[PDB]
Nucleic acid binder design. Structure first.
Ligand SMILES: [Mg+2]
Ligand SMILES: [Mg+2]
Ligand SMILES: [Mg+2]
Ligand SMILES: [Mg+2]
Ligand SMILES: [Mg+2]
Ligand SMILES: [Mg+2]
Ligand SMILES: [Mg+2]
Ligand SMILES: [Mg+2]
Ligand SMILES: [Mg+2]
Ligand SMILES: [Mg+2]
Lengths: 224, 188, 77, 149
RNA sequence: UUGAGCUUUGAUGUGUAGGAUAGGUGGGAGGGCCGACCUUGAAAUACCACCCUUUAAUGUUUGAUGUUCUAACGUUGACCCGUAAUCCGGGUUGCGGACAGUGUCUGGUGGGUAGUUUGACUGGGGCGGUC
């Protein structure tokens, strides 16, 4: 076994600041292939309360571009204007039939309030249970979709709901500038606490850990 | 939350008296000779669904509440929650067990069912009057010696039990009225 | 009267104050308690009506000292 | 309440000790029965430097005298004749006071508050077993028979 | 006698369908052999991550009643004394016993009681309307 340098360098007792062990994140790795960096975030959420839902999208700059699989629903000339955004399937309910076929390539599903009609009842159990619904608080169903799709496919890391208290989002590739990743990770507070559910509990951001795939264990302070 | 006075509100308003939404169903205003005016309102508790009787004083009054109803469409159930959506705003929404009480067995998928939401949150869902459902279990009816109609107990794909005439077998879709819990027709 | 035989804590008057600042008169009463103290000097049990503060004062200062102080003050125990 | 002990007590410590004890416990039980004195500096010095020998002599002489009294009430038999009905079953329950003054009549000089009988009452005739708490560390037994008079 | 939390050593979630002997949620090719690919549901599977679900060793922070005891306290139980006294106090004794009760603080209830409010216009006032 070669998975034990991690257990040599697990510091659960000495919690680090942002600057301390940030540079060691890949020095803690022995991976065969290349991976991304993950995040650790929490916030008091009544398991019971549903009025605690926050869906949308978080734009995280300075990093990976079009590495996402999107499915779009538009009506009109935007069916061709959207192909200018490098989108994959800008089309009609044939895409819904593709979903019925059990399609796992496309991950983030987009619509337009005119053709949203098609989207809602289509893949209805499927997309939303797939944790990919289309609310309006998030702008996944716009009228000016040209100005948003280039971003949603370009650089967006979406916040998600989980049955557990857990809410752990994703950072970009390991090989980026570690200091800049610190700023990127910092650019998440302004939105993760932009819209609470007003029934927040004892604290706001209890956990802060930066694990890349299974390698890094960097516990951090809620403030710093 | 404009406060409402007794001799002002007629039926339909959603008053918020005592940390609890209500719904005025009927109201009788009285102005007798020589005495303080009052209204005998036939209120409706909007959470348990029981009709309460309240005589209100001209002066006595209450704030309004955000209790509203429109046409949501059922999507799916997961664990303890039911999720529905609008066709004019396409706003997502999630209810709970309390809201769907005894209508669990009536909602299938894509049913357009009126729901009452309060504080921007559902409290009570009303299944469409007639729902088409399929029967999971029945005893193959055999007329035997029956001289009257007889009837037959039949479970449905959503758990419900209805009396179906005799011929409906298994795999036949029937139509039931959610209101009475009774068979209406076997939809071909 | 409700007066601690050791200190002399009397019922003092004050106010009830509501949330709307409505003042109504009231009394504060000293936490009096009849208690038998063991006077080792006299091999006896003497009973003083003391408050709890008086009990603590006796704890600290010794009972015979308090009794001598009472005799000096001219207070029958 | 800091207090200095003048005797071996149950779960605090041997004499000549400095123990933190609850105020109520020190005030109501310990100090009236000589088993403790508040830890005023005057008493600390007065005891340690001046008394912690003499009072120890007194304590050990008392322990020896009580072991002596235990040896002396080793007759192990004392007669009790009280009124009883049929089938034994004394009408009048003989008690601690009766046992004490009877053994003082025929035996040792022992106080009424000393006897400690476990069964509680002694309502019936016959051989009974009674314990005697003569000192906080030593006991005594006597066989008491109740003959129906 | 135990109950909830907290450093904590670990284990552990058993259906449909996937062979079943899937905890959730993202990132998802790691360590003799799996994995992804495929069968699949409502979610699809190695790899560890954030934790839920219980379970067992310590420091845990503790409360919870449940028994015993006597010494505080209660006694409008019996007897003795002050005493020519069904008051009061003292003394023996029995029964309760750290409960009861009282003081400060506090939540609830509180027309039992108290202080008060309850508009103006108006072809008199009221009701209706109006500001
Ligand atoms: Mg005044
Ligand atoms: Mg004070
Ligand atoms: Mg008791
Ligand atoms: Mg109390
Ligand atoms: Mg109060
Ligand atoms: Mg009232
Ligand atoms: Mg009044
Ligand atoms: Mg006014
Ligand atoms: Mg007029
Ligand atoms: Mg009017």
């Amino acid at each position: 076994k070669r998975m034990r340098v991690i257990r040599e360098k697990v510091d659960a007792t000495k919690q680090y600041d942002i600057n301390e062990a940030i540079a060691l994140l890949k020095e803690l790795a022995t991976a065969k292939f290349v991976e991304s960096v993950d995040v650790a975030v929490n916030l008091g959420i009544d398991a019971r309360k549903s009025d605690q839902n926050v869906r949308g999208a978080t734009v995280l700059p300075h990093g990976t571009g079009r590495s996402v699989r999107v499915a779009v629903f538009t009506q009109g000339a935007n069916a061709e204007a959207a192909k200018a955004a490098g989108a994959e399937l800008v089309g009609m309910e044939d895409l819904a039939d593709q979903i019925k076929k059990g399609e796992m390539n496309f991950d983030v599903v987009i619509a337009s309030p005119d053709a949203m009609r098609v989207v809602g009842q289509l893949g209805q159990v499927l997309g939303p249970r797939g944790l990919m619904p289309n609310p309006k608080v998030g702008t996944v169903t716009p009228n000016v979709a040209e100005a948003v799709k280039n971003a949603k496919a370009g650089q967006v890391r979406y916040r998600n709901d989980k049955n557990g208290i857990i809410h752990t989002t994703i950072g970009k590739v390991d090989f980026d500038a570690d200091k800049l990743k610190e700023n990127l990770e910092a650019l998440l507070v302004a939105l993760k606490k932009a819209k609470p559910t007003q029934a927040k509990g004892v604290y706001i951001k209890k956990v802060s850990i930066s694990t890349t795939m299974g390698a890094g264990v960097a516990v951090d302070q809620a403030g710093l | 939350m404009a406060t409402y006075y007794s001799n002002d509100f007629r039926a339909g308003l959603k008053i918020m008296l005592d940390g609890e939404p209500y719904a005025v169903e009927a109201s009788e205003f009285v102005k007798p000779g020589k005495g303080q005016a009052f209204a005998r309102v036939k209120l409706r508790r909007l959470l348990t669904g029981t009709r309460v009787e309240k005589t209100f004083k001209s002066t006595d009054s209450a704030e309004g509440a955000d209790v509203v109803d429109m046409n949501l469409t059922y999507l799916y159930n997961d664990g303890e929650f039911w999720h529905f959506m609008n066709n004019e705003t396409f706003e997502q929404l999630s209810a709970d067990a309390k809201a769907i009480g005894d209508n669990a067995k009536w909602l299938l998928d894509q049913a357009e069912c009126i729901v009452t939401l309060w504080n921007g949150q559902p409290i009570s869902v009303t299944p469409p009057n007639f729902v088409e459902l399929e029967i999971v279990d029945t005893d193959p009816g055999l007329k035997g010696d029956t001289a009257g109609t007889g009837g037959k107990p039949a479970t449905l794909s959503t758990g419900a039990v209805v009396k179906v005439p005799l011929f409906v077998q298994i795999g036949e879709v029937i139509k039931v009225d959610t209101r009475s819990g009774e068979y209406v027709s076997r939809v071909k | 009267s409700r007066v601690c035989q050791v200190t002399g804590k009397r019922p003092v008057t004050g106010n009830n104050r509501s949330h709307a600042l409505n003042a109504t008169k009231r009394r504060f009463l000293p936490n009096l308690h009849s208690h038998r103290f063991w006077v080792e000097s006299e091999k006896r049990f003497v009973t003083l009506r003391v408050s709890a503060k008086g009990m603590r004062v006796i704890d600290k200062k010794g009972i015979d000292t308090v009794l001598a102080e009472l005799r000096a003050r001219g207070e029958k125990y | 309440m800091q207090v200095i002990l003048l005797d071996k007590v149950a779960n605090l410590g041997s004499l000549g000790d400095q123990v933190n004890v609850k105020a109520g416990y020190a005030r109501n039980f310990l100090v009236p029965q000589g088993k403790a004195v508040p830890a005023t500096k005057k008493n600390i010095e007065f005891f340690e430097a001046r008394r912690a020998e003499l009072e120890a002599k007194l304590a050990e002489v008392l322990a020896a005298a009580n072991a002596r009294a235990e040896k002396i009430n080793a007759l192990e038999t004392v007669t009790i004749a009280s009124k009883a009905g049929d089938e034994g079953k004394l009408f009048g329950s003989i008690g601690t006071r009766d046992i004490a003054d009877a053994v003082t009549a025929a035996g040792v000089e022992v106080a009424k508050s000393e006897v400690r009988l476990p069964n509680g009452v002694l309502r019936t005739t016959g051989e009974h077993e009674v314990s005697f708490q003569v000192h906080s560390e030593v006991f005594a037994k006597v066989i008491v028979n109740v003959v129906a008079e």
